[PDB]
Structures are given as C-alpha cells and as structure tokens.
Amino acid sequence: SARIAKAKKLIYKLEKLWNARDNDGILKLFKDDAVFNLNGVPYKGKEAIKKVLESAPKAKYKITKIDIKIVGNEIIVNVDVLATGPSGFTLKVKSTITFDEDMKITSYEVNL
Ligand SMILES: COc1ccc(-n2nc(C(N)=O)c3c2C(=O)N(c2ccc(N4CCCCC4=O)cc2)CC3)cc1
Prior knowledge:
Elements: H1 2-19, H2 23-27, E1 30-38, E2 41-44, H3 46-55, E3 60-70, E4 75-84, E5 90-99, E6 105-111
Ligand GG2 binds next to helix 1, helix 3, strand 3, strand 4 and strand 5.
C-alpha cells in the first residue's frame, strides 16, 4: 500500500517526464547500471539509456492500466500505455518497470 502508491506516483511522474522529453528528469529516476530493455534490446548503464531517451519518437503517452507486484524488496510494475505518434497513429504499448528498495529504477522493459 505504502510502496504501491509511491510507485504509482513515480509512474504518473514518468508519464509527464516522457511527454515533456525531460530525459534528464527520467534518468534521475534510474540506478546508474540499470537496463532499458527496448523491445528485447537491453541498454545497460545511464550512458546507453540517455541515448534511448533521445532517439525515442516524438510521442504522446497515456496510461490506461497499472499492475503493481511486490516480489520482496523489489516492485515490478506493469503499465499499459496508449502511445500516440507524431502523425496521430495510436499504438498500445507496455512497460515493465522494476524498482528496488529505495524506489530506484533497475530495469525498464518496453515491448511493442
Ligand atoms: C505511436 O507508436 C509508437 C511506437 C513506438 C514508440 N517508441 N519507440 C521507442 C524507441 N524506438 O525508443 C520507445 C517508444 C515508446 O512507446 N516508449 C515509451 C513507452 C511507454 C512509456 N510510458 C508512458 C508513461 C508511464 C509508463 C511508461 O513507461 C514511455 C515511453 C519509449 C521507447 C512510440 C510510439
């Protein structure tokens, strides 16, 4: 409950971060050696993640469903997202975001 809502606040904070392309603000939510799994392709380290952030399309995202799981000291969050692209094509995407005990992102899978 406590860790659930805090994780939820982080997700909705991430939605605004993604739409404003606040890539610095996004990276601050990560661990240094976290992995951004972009469609089966992992990017370990904040240097490879910042690139993933900058190469992302100019998209608008809307959350449509949050699934929070407690696997101990880690919270695994599944989020359904409506991804609207730069030319109006709306696509259903999904993210699997894992937080550690200090609410830092250790893994961030996005599957399309
Ligand atoms: C219109 O259709 C698309 C298709 C693909 C892409 N596309 N491309 C890339 C890439 N080639 O890098 C990425 C994405 C994407 O959808 N990404 C993302 C997914 C979901 C979230 N959200 C939302 C808020 C809170 C939770 C959360 O995780 C944030 C960013 C980043 C990566 C965009 C649009």
